[PDB]
Every structure is written in C-alpha cells, then in structure tokens.
C-alpha cells in the first residue's frame, strides 16, 4: 500500500514513493543512496514534529489518502554534521502572478 513523498531540505526536493508499512529509518536509507549521508546524520519531520526511526510512515500519518502521487506529502529533512544539529529550513517555492481577470 504505497505513499508518495516530497523529501525537502533548503533548495533540494526529492520525489519518491515508499510503503505505508515501511519505516522512517528505511526512508533515510533511500535518502542515503541519493544524497550520500548516513541515517545517523539525518533527521526527518512531518511539519515541525520530528519522526521516530522505529515507527512506520503509516503511524507518522502518511497514508494513501494524504500522500497521493498528484499531491505528495512533504517530509522535512535536516543534516547533523558531527555536533552540528542544523535546524529544519525549507526554501519555499516561487509564487505565480495574480490570476488574470479573464480566468475569474
């Protein structure tokens, strides 16, 4: 049973899928393979709340109905660097111009 995720840190954004069942740890293993940083240097969030390596994505609240391919759920990323416990920072996306009158 799959969930669709945007994993986001600063001006990085990773588009991937995982099982509802699969664990926050196992997700960090996918992130290792992409960015090259071990799980013990990561820290994943759902919003501002930090996640637990043991818990399933399903338990953290990532579900079929709230992490759909066309509307993926956002996983926050922060990188430890020895004692550098960096803060969660997500550089927002650009804004669209105001809706032309002909579309109102």
């Amino acid at each position: 049973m799959d969930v669709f995720l945007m994993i986001r840190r600063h001006k990085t954004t990773i588009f991937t899928d995982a099982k509802e069942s699969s664990t926050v740890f196992e997700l960090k293993r996918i992130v290792e393979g992409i960015l090259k940083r071990p799980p013990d240097e990561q820290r994943l969030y759902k919003d501002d709340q930090l996640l637990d390596d043991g818990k399933t994505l399903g338990e953290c609240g990532f579900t079929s109905q709230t992490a759909r391919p066309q509307a993926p759920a956002t996983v926050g990323l922060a990188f430890r660097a020895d004692d550098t416990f960096e803060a969660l920072c997500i550089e927002p996306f650009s804004s669209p111009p105001e809706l032309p009158d002909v579309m109102k």
């Binding site: 990085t12 954004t13 588009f15 066309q70 996306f93 650009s94 579309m103």
Partner: protein, 96 residues
C-alpha cells in the same frame, strides 16, 4: 537511477530517470552525449520554468507513471487556476 532537474530560481528536484523521460524534451536532453566519456546526462537546467511549476511537472511525472496501464479507477490530476497558464506553457515546452 535519479536525475536532478533545476528551476529558473535555482531549486533542485531529484526524481527517478524513467519518470523524467516522460518529457520528450527531457528525453532528448538526457539521451544525447555528455559528461567526458558518457552517453547520457544526470543534471538539467531550466531557464524559463520556476520552482512552483517544475514541482507540479514532477507531480505529474509521478502520476503519469503510477496510473498508466492501471485497472484501478484513475483520480483527476488537479491544477489550480493561478498556476494553470504557466504549467500549460511548461508542458508545451516539455512535450508531455
């Protein structure tokens, strides 16, 4: 295998290659030569397309791969009016 797509405003988007190849425009940017002694690319720079759009373009790639050849009922791909015009532009450019 993952590729990196980069928006006009410098945002990085790390997606699966197969997903990105959905775009003919990208398919032709990746399949040609480059990288000293390599016959395919792993990094693309967009000059026109901003982050809020290219995000959506990836969301689509995800959707397209998931729901092509699926006997599961398909959900509607949503577009907010505000983003519509730019996204149309982008798609037209990207051939997808």
């Amino acid at each position: 295998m993952y590729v990196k797509l980069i928006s006009s405003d410098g945002h990085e988007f790390i997606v699966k290659r197969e997903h990105a190849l959905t775009s003919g425009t990208i398919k032709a940017m990746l399949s040609g030569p480059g990288q000293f002694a390599e016959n395919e690319t792993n990094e693309v720079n967009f000059r026109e397309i901003p982050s809020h759009v290219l995000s959506k373009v990836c969301m689509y790639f995800t959707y397209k791969v998931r729901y092509t050849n699926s006997s599961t009922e398909i959900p509607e791909f949503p577009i907010a009016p505000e983003i519509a015009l730019e996204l149309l532009m982008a798609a037209n450019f990207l051939d997808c």
